[PDB]
Design a protein around this ligand. Sequence first.
Ligand SMILES: [Mg+2]
Ligand SMILES: [Mg+2]
Ligand SMILES: [Mg+2]
Ligand SMILES: [Mg+2]
Lengths: 277, 277, 277, 277
Amino acid sequence: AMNVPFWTEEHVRATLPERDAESHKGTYGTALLLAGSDDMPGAALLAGLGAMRSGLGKLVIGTSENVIPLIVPVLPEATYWRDGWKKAADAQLEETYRAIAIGPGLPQTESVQQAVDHVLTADCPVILDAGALAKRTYPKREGPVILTPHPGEFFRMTGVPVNELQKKRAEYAKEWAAQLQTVIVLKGNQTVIAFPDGDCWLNPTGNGALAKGGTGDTLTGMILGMLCCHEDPKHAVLNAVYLHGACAELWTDEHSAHTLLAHELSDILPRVWKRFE
Amino acid sequence: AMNVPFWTEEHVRATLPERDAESHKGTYGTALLLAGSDDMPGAALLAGLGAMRSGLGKLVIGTSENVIPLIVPVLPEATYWRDGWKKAADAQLEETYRAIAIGPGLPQTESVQQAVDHVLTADCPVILDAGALAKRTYPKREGPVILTPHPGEFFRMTGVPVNELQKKRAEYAKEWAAQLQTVIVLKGNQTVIAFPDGDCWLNPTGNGALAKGGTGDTLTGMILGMLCCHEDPKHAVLNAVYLHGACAELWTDEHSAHTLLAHELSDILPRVWKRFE
Amino acid sequence: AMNVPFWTEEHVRATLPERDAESHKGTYGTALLLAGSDDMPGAALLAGLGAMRSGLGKLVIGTSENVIPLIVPVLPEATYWRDGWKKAADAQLEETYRAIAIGPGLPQTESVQQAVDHVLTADCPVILDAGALAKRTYPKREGPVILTPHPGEFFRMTGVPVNELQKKRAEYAKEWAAQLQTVIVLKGNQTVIAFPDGDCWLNPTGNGALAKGGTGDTLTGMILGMLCCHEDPKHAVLNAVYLHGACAELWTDEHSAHTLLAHELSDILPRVWKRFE
Amino acid sequence: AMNVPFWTEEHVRATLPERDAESHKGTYGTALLLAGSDDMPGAALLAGLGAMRSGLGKLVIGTSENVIPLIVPVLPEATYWRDGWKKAADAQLEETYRAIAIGPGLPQTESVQQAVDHVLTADCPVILDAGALAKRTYPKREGPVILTPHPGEFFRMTGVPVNELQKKRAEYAKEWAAQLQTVIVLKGNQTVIAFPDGDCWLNPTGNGALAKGGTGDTLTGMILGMLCCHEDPKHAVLNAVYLHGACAELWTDEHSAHTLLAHELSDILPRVWKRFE
Ligand SMILES: [Mg+2]
Ligand SMILES: [Mg+2]
Ligand SMILES: [Mg+2]
Ligand SMILES: [Mg+2]
C-alpha cells in the first residue's frame, strides 16, 4: 500500500563491485564474525561460509573454543579469535575491522548485549542477528547498524505481534527503522529492507526452499562479506538479500524446494553472482 | 496372495506437498531425532541428513554429547539437545515437536525403552527404529506410531522366525500392525507398509544397492522429515519409502549397485523429488 | 620370462558378482578392518571408504579410539570396535566376519603380530598389509591369507633386496607365495598376483597417478569389500587390483597424473565398476 | 623498466615433468610441511592439500597436535610428525626429505626461527612463508631457500616500505634475492620470481579472486609438491606460481572472482595441470 519498490536485477547489476587485478586482500577488508556457541555451533559455519564467499579479504571468527574445530575442515580459510564473542562482553575491540556481525548461534543473554555495546563503539557497519536481537535502543555512531529479524524476532524487538506485523510488513519495518535509526531487514517472502533515512525496498527473489533452519545464518554472513567489497553499505545489504534469494531460485530449477540445505546457498552463489556481472 | 497394491508413481505425484512462497520454517515444523551413541555415531548423521533433506522446518538432534561434533561439519543446519536420548529416559518432553524419531544408533536397552515411553506421551507421530525396536505393546495416544523393522528386528518384536516371515511378509506385517495398532514398515525388497486400520501397500522402488549398512538410518530420517511437510502422515510414510528406493534406482543408472553409500541417497533426493513434482 | 598372463577385462566381466533384488546386507557379509593408529590415522579412512565402496554388507572398523571421530563425518555408514586392533592382541575374535583386513596405519610391532595370530584362527579370508607385514610363517587354516607388500615390504618379509626383486618380480612373488602358502599381491607397475597353488597373474591397469601415499590403503579396503561380494576369493583379489588401477586410468583422462589423491579412487569406483557390468 | 620476462605457457609446457608408468612414491619423494598452530590451524590444511595435489610421493605434516584431527578427514593421505614445528626448534631433523616448507599458520616468534635454523642444515630446498619470514640472513647451504612474502612481509624482511616497494617491485625483489642469496617470490598481481643468480621472471596468470585469505598457504603447498616432482627447483617454483594463478583464471570463467575459496584452487589444479601436458 506504500508501493515499496523492488530492488531489481537492473539495480543489482548497476551496483555490484568489480574485483580488479590491482587488488590485495587488504583492499577487501577484514570482517569479524561473532557467532556460534557450544549449544548452537552450526550457525558459525553457515555464516562463516556465507561471509568468505561474499567478497571479503579476510575473516576472523570469534566463536566458542569448542566450535573452532568444527569449522576448520570446511572453511580452512578462516582465522579465529578464540572465545571472541565472550571476550567482547568485557572490553572494546582493539583491532580494526571493515565490518562486524554478531548473533548467529548466540544465546539471548545480557552478556551478548554487553558484547553488542562494545562492538558498536567500533567505526564500521555492524549486523545484529538472532541472539543479538533484543528490545533496545542504539547509540549515535559512525557506521550503520543492520538488524536482520524474522517476524518473531521483530515482535521481541518491538512488541508488534506477528499476526499484526504480517498484515503491514513494510509499514512496520519502515516505522521501526526510523524510530531505532537502524537498517531493518525483515525476513520472509518479499523481505523488506528499510533504511533509517526512510528509503525502503522489497526483495523480489527467493522461495520456500529458504523456509528451513540455517538460511538466515547464511544471509548474515553474505551481508557481512558484501559490506567488505561494496563502498556503499546500503547496496551491500540489498545485493546480499537479493543474491541469497536468487541462489534458492537456481536450486529449484532442478531440485525440489523441500530439499535445500542452507550451506548449499553458499556453494551456489559463485555461479549466481557471475550471472549478474 | 493378498494382492497388496503398490504405492505407485501416480499416488506419489498426487500426494507430495507444495512448498508455497507464503511459508516460513514454522509452517514446516520442528522435528526431534533421538539417535546416535558414542558406540554407533554414524546413524545420527545419516538420519539427520535424511530428515533435513526431507522438507522439515527445523531439526533438533538429541544425540550423545560426543557425537555432536561429528555431525556439525556435515549438517551445520541442525541444532542439538545435548544427551537428549538419555535425558528423555527421565522425563516427559517439555517442547512441542511436529514429529519424533527414536532409535538409530541407540543400544537395545531398557533406558531406551523408558525414553520411548516418555516420547509417546507427546501428541505427534513417532517413529521407532533400530535399538528402539522391542517386543512390547503401545499406549492409545494421539498420533501414529511407525515401526521400521528389518526382518531380524521383526523377529525380535513378534517371535516370528525370519525364515517363516519371508514366506508371507505382507500377511505377517498386516497381522502385527493390527495387533500392535502401529504402522509397520517391514523392510526388504518390496518393503511392506502396513497400517493399523488394515490398509497395506507394497513399495515398488529400490534395488540391491540398498542392502548395505546405513540405508535404513537414512530412511528413518526421510520419514521424519516427510511427516513434517505432509498433512497426512500415511502419505508421508509411503512417499518416504518410495523416494528412498527411487534414489537407489537413479544411482544404478550410471553407478554399480555394489558401490552406493547410504549418505548419497540424501544427496540424490533433491533431483529425484523434483521429478515427481 | 615366465609369460605370466594378464587378468584382462574379459576375465573381470566374467567374474564380477551381481547384486540381486532379493538381497539383504547379510547376504553381502560383515567385514572387519583393523587399521589406523593415533600416529597414522588416515589409513583407516582410506581403507574404510575402499571397503564400503566395494560391495560388502556391513563394515566394523577396529581402530584406535581417537581415530573414530575422524572417520565418522566422511564414512557415517561404518560402525566401530573401539581399540579393536589392540584388543585383538589379547584374545580370539568372538564375532564371525566374512573377511578381515589388518595393518594399514598400524605400527610394525610385536603386538600387531599377536593380533594377526588371533585373527588367523577365524575361518575367513584375511588380508595383511603395511604394519602387519613381517618376516614370518603362517598356520594351516581355513581361508586364504592375502599379503599386499610393496617391494620394500617384500624385502622385509623375505630378505630379497629390492634391486634384485625388481628384475624378476613374478618369479620371486610366485616362489614366496608357494613357500609361505599365502596369496601375494606384489605392488608396482604390473602388480603381480601370485597364489599359493601356483596360479599367477599380472595386473594390466593403473599408472603413475597411484605412486603416492594412501593408494595402497585404498586397495586393501577394496580387496576387503570384494571378498565379501565374490564367492571366489581369488576373483575378489584379482578384480580389486584391476578396478583400483582402472580408477587411476579414468582419472588421467582429464586430470594430471601428478594430482590424484587416493580417496578419489573410491569416489571413481562407482562409475568404473558400472562399465564392467 | 627492467623488462622482466613472463614465465609463459610455452615455458610451463616445456618444463613440467612426466609421471612415468615405471614410478613408485619414492621416486617422487617425501615432503615435510611445518605449518598450522592451534591459533591458525587452517593454513596447514590449505598447504597440505596444495602439496599433495602437486606431485609429491609422500607428505609428512609437522603440525600442532590439536590441528592433526582437523586435517585427517579432508586429507587422509597425509601422515604426521606430532608437534613437528615445535620439535624442530630443539634439534636437527633426523629424517631425509626431498623438500621442506615452514611457516604457514605459524607465529612470528624466535622459536619458529630456531626451527628454520635447524631445517636449513638439511640438504634439500626449503620454503619459508608467513610466520617463518623475518629480517635475517641465511647460511651457505646445499639447496635453495625460497621466500614467499607478500609486500607487508617484504617490508618486515627488508625495511622497504610497501608504498615504495609497489613502485619498483621487480627491482627490489631482484636486489634482495641477490643480497640474501635466496629465491624471492614477491606476491601480488604480476608476482615476481627473483633468483639469487640474477634470473628474474614475472608471473602472467591470476586475478583478484586470489586476493583473499588462504590463497598463499595453498601456493606454499603447491611449491612444496612441485619441488618433489621437478628435477630443477627453479622450474618447480615458476610452474607452481603459474599454475596457481591459472586455477584462479579457470574459476572466473563461470564463477565470480569475489567468491573463490583458496582450497578450491587445489580442487581445480587436476584439470588445469592436464591442459599443460
Ligand atoms: Mg535467524
Ligand atoms: Mg536398521
Ligand atoms: Mg602400503
Ligand atoms: Mg601469506
